[PDB]
Each structure stands twice: as structure tokens, then as C-alpha cells.
């Protein structure tokens, strides 16, 4: 596909995907285990920007 | 465009797009008349995954 | 790759991929277990139209 | 990236991006300063169409 | 195709595509009924810059 | 769609659809009323070279 | 490349290259020996529409 | 072009082009002198799967 | 954007923008201070071949 | 361009781009200030694997 | 991902992974068990031509 | 292909191919006869940044 999950987010380098920095959630990916790529933030920002017009 | 509606969803083969399997909604596309392609589910999943962070 | 399998066809929602509706091939995907995306139909259609040339 | 902000929306020609047609918001981009391209409306429509299934 | 018309220009929001603001051509789209996307401007700009070569 | 029908074949210039040439079949497009593009010819030559017939 | 010459024009099916139909330029191609693809036509029509001329 | 012959098949590493391993056709390429790329294999497998034959 | 400005033209090596060569105009880029890429040259040669001038 | 920098790597979330975790290079991005996307790893990996050939 | 690993290299036909040929190393793929594609060969030849070593 | 040599480097405008400016290698191209495109520069800079060397 043109845009796959891997094009939108990548495994967080801090928790290596666990979402954890024990005993707390991982601060770098705020618990998700992944961080957004520029393409993912572009798409997310766009949707949030216009979803409720 | 890079991603058109047709790249994101296709007409449901069960109801041929009607969203109906009379007398009930069509079960395969749960009433929408279309089903998601891998590219559409990837995009939808991504948005739902991060929209409320 | 530019056009991967998932860009061409998607799991049939009627048989969820088995290609079967016992005792018959699944009629929605013609026993293939997948339905074509618009890009897949476009390609199949073109090859078929010009196969003898 | 495959789809950048500029592929999804363009500066509104009426307010040149200000979101204003003084003393009121700009009517053409309904206050946002940008209007959607076909690719942006396709993506937005798709998300709104399936986000709550 | 890789770059379709809709990738290049989008219906002008001021005249909704007529190209008119009677009695004049619509000033926002220069009577064209469409405004350029960034990709359209990029292309037009390049051709114009090197047209005599 | 990256590869559309019109990117694989372009309407025949010697006819324009009727795919004919009164009273026999059109020579240029063998009656199909469309000719192949470099992309279309490329795909077809490949499939035919390997479908191993 | 994204858009190659091959993406923009095809070998004319009437003169096949020369663009000649003796003793005159090939009518179908205007002597050029090539006809436009849908991509070629889209880009050219775009430029023609806004080039100013 | 989106998909060029080069995208679909490579020079066979056993006969390097000829597809021959004297006195017989090259086993690895079936004499064709080329082996398939993952893109080639995806498209061919697609067509084979639905061509009906 | 699939095709950006910098994919159509790359800064001239003999000058670097001033598009000059004291006291006359820069030879390599004819004063435009940018030279064409294969993509840029491709597009321009096509437009010029068909704009029919 | 088809693959831009942002398609290859994204600001490291641990050092926010400085490449530093004083007094050391940031261990998460190896002092680079960026982490690779899947496309970036794929490319780096391929070049490295075949660098001596 | 536009360019995946399998688009840069395709499994060697003379071995299939072991990257060997008992008792020495595989000749065709020099022990790497994968050969280069036009895309992969293209990228590698470019990097090597400019990395200036 | 996605990225062709033509996408990565252009004919040098100082020596036009040879990369020579007698009796020395062409300064602009380092004798290579080609200069980098923005795409070439992006990919090379990427590899250089992480190759380790
Ligand atoms: Zn984390
Ligand atoms: Zn249905
Ligand atoms: Zn089925
Ligand atoms: Zn506005
Ligand atoms: Zn207007
Ligand atoms: Zn005809
Ligand atoms: Zn002709
Ligand atoms: Zn062979
Ligand atoms: Zn210059
Ligand atoms: Zn870091
Ligand atoms: Zn081998
Ligand atoms: Zn030079």
C-alpha cells in the first residue's frame, strides 16, 4: 500500500515498543510504544484540524 | 490522487453496495455498502489509535 | 513495492478468506477467498482484454 | 512524504489564509484559512464515514 | 495516473467553478474556475520559468 | 488509483471507440477501439512472457 | 522517474513513429509520431489552461 | 513509468541474459534469461489467480 | 508533493544562484541560476513538443 | 521527491534532535538526533549488506 | 513502504538462502543468498559512485 | 522504477558528461560527469549519516 502502518509510526526507541519505563509509562511515546513519523503526524493533524467543521 | 475513495474501500460483494440483506442490514459491510481495503483499515486504525492522545 | 497483493484484492468478507461456502466455492469471491480492489479489477480487466495480443 | 499538508489543503484564495473577511470570518474557508484539495476531502470523508462503526 | 487534474487544481471556492463573478472573470481563480494546488503551482511555475528553453 | 485504465490504454486515433472501419474491423486497434500505452504494453509483454501461457 | 516520456506519449498507431502518411505529415499525430497518453493530456491541458497564451 | 520491465524481472544470475546453460535452456530462468522480482511475482500471481485458466 | 521544484531543477554548479558570471550572464544556466533535471528536462521537452507552441 | 529525509528518519524523541544526552551522544539515536523509519532502515540495511560489491 | 527489501534484492535462484554451495560459498550471490534487482543495483551503484568511498 | 539513476544525478552542465575540464577532472562534478539531484543528495546524505564511516 501507498501508506502502511510503518510509514505512519515507528517503534519508540526508549521503551522499544513496551510503552513502559518502569514503574511509569514511557514518557517518549506516552505509553503507546510507537512514535509518529512526519507522515503520520501530517495525517493526524489534518484529520483533527477538520474533523469537526 | 495518491489515495482515492476506491483505494480505501470497495463495494461489498454481499449486498453489491445496498447495505441490505433484506429484511436486515447487510452483515458483511454492516450496513455501509462497502468494505475496507487493507489501506483503508490501516488509515482508519491509525487515526483511531492516536486521535485522542 | 508499488502495487502489493493487498493493493489488488482483500479478504472476502463472506467466507473470511477460506474461498468456501460448503459444499461450494464461495460465490462472492468465486472460491478465491479474496475480492478485487478497483486497482485489481482494473489490472485483471486490462490483461484479459488484450491477452491474445 | 507521500501526502504532505500541501497535498491535503491549500491557502484560501479569498482571505489568502487569514480566515477573515472583515468584520466576519471568511466564508470560503469558513475561518480556517485553507480549503481542502480533492485528496484532503477524500481522506476526511473516509475517516468521518467509518470512525464510529 | 500519478498526477491527475485534481492533484493540480481544485474548484475555486469563490465562484464554485463557474470562473465568473459577473460581469467579470472571477478574480480569485482568474476566470479559470479552479485554484492551483501546491503541486499545480510548482509545475506551472517550472514550465513558465523555462518555457523559452 | 496509481494505475488506471487510461494509463494502460489510450483511445485509438484511427477510430475513436467503434473499434471498426466499415465494413470490416478497425486495423490499428484490431476492433478493441483502444491502443496500448508504454505502461500497458509493458505489463502485457511481462504477463505474456511469464504466464508461460 | 515519476513521469517519464513514456508516461506522456505513445508511438502513434497510424505512422508508427515517423508521424508521416505520405506525402503528408501523419494526420493522427501531426507528424510528431506520438500520441498523448491520458497523463500527457492531463499535464498539457493543465499547462495550456494557466500558462497565459 | 510506475512499473517498468526492470521492476518486474531481473537478469538471471545463472546464465546472465541468455537463459542458457548449454546445451539446455537455463534451468533457473527457463531460458528466458530473467528471473522475477517480488513485484513481478505479485502481479503474475495475481493475474494467474483470477485470469481463469 | 511527488514532484517538487528541486526535483525539476537543481541549483547551477557554475554559479549557485546569482545566475551570473561577472560582468555578463551565467553561461551554464543562462542567468536562471538553476539547471534542469532528467525529470524537469523530460517535462519541459514534452510540453514544448505539444503545446504546439 | 519520492523519498525525502522525513521519509527516512524522524527527530529522536529522547534528545528531541540534539543527538546528545550529556556528556554522551544520545544512546537512542546514536548521537544522530534522528531515529530511522522502516523505509530508512530498509535502505541503510541494503546498502550496508552490499557495500563491498 | 515504497521501497521494501524485496524490491531491492530477490532471493538467489542458484541456492535459496543458505548462501552456500557445499563445501564452499555460493558463486551467484557470493554467500549473501540474495541477488540485486534493477532498483537495488541502481541504488547501490549510485551510493558507491558518490560516497566517494 | 521508483528511483532511477536519472532521479539521482544529472549530466554535469560544465563538462557535459566527461567530467573533464582539460587537463583536469571537471571541478563541478569531480570528473564523474554528473551532479546530484535533490533526491540523490537526500539519499546519499542519509547513507553517509548512518553508514558508520
Ligand atoms: Zn516509548
Ligand atoms: Zn454489504
Ligand atoms: Zn468468499
Ligand atoms: Zn478564507
Ligand atoms: Zn473563481
Ligand atoms: Zn481503431
Ligand atoms: Zn502518426
Ligand atoms: Zn538464467
Ligand atoms: Zn549558472
Ligand atoms: Zn536522540
Ligand atoms: Zn546463491
Ligand atoms: Zn562536470
Numbering used by the authors:
A (entry chain D), B (entry chain D), C (entry chain A), D (entry chain D), E (entry chain A), F (entry chain C), ...: 1 to 53
Per the authors:
The low-pH crystals belong to the space group H3 with four AT monomers per asymmetric unit whereas the high-pH crystals belong to the space group P21 and contain 48 AT monomers in the asymmetric part. The architecture of this dodecamer is identical to the one observed for B. subtilis AT at pH 6.5. As with B. subtilis AT, trimer–trimer association within the B. licheniformis dodecamer is maintained mainly by hydrophobic interactions in two regions. The second region of stabilising interactions includes van der Waals contacts between pairs of adjacent zinc-binding domains formed along the 2-fold molecular axes by residues Pro13 and Ile35. Its inner surface is lined by the side chains of twelve Val2 residues, this amino acid is strictly conserved in AT proteins. The calculated pKa value for the amino group of Met1 is 7.1. This indicates that the salt bridge formation is favoured in case of the low-pH crystal form (pH 6.0) as the amino group of Met1 is likely to be protonated.
Here, we report two crystal structures of Bacillus licheniformis AT, which shares 66% sequence identity with B. subtilis AT.
